[PDB]
Symmetry: C2
Subunit: 129 residues, 2 copies
Amino acid sequence: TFSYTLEDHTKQAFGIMNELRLSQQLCDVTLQVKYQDAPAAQFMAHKVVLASSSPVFKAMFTNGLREQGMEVVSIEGIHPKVMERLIEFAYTASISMGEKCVLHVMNGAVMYQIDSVVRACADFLVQQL
Amino acid sequence: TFSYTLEDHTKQAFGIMNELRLSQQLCDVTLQVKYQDAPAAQFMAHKVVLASSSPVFKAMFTNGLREQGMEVVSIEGIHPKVMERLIEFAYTASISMGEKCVLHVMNGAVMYQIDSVVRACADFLVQQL
C-alpha cells in the first residue's frame, strides 16, 4: 500500500478554524460570561473545537439531543479575559498573560480541565519562589 | 509577560475530534455519497473540520444563513471509499490507499482542493515511471 501524512496539517487546519471563529462563521455556541462587577462579555465558538480541548466542554455539549443551531451558555465564576485566553488556547495551542494574571488563568484552566495549561501555570508559580 | 505553547495540542485535539466523529457526536453535516452503480453511503462530520481542510467545503458551508442543526449534502462524482479516505485525512492528517487507488484519490483531492493530498498523489504517480 501507499501511505502519506502531513505533519503540519493539524496546525494549518486549526489556523483556519481560528479564522472562522474570528469571522463568526459556522459557530454553534455563544458563551455569555458574566463575572461579579466586570462587564458582561460574549464569545462565539465551535462546540467541537471547545470539546476537543476541554473535557468539561465536551460533556457539557455531548447530550442525546440534536440541538438546533445556536446554543447560548451562561458562564459564571470566571473573568471574561480568562475565558478569552482559554478559548484562544483551544484554537491556537498558545496562551499569553502577565505575571499577575497567571493565577486566575490556572483557576479557569482547572475549572475547564485544560490539563496542558494547568501544568504550565503551576510550573510558573513554583518558579516564582 | 508569560507565554506558553503546547506543540502537541493540535494533534491531540484532532484525535478527540476524530473520536467525536466516529461516535457521531456534535455532527452538523451528513454527506450522502452516491456514485454510479456503487451502493450509496453516508458520512457524518463537523462542517468546521471539513472547512478547515478543504477550501471547497469551507465555501459550501459558509453562507449568510444560520442553518438549524443537521444539513444533508448530496455528493456526486466521487466514490464512497475516496470520500471516506478524504474525510479521514481531514480528521487524522494521514491517508492510506493501495497503489491502484492513488488515481481516484487525487481526482477526489483535486475536486475538494485538498492541496496537501494532491501534491502527494502526484509525487507517487510520477515515481511509478
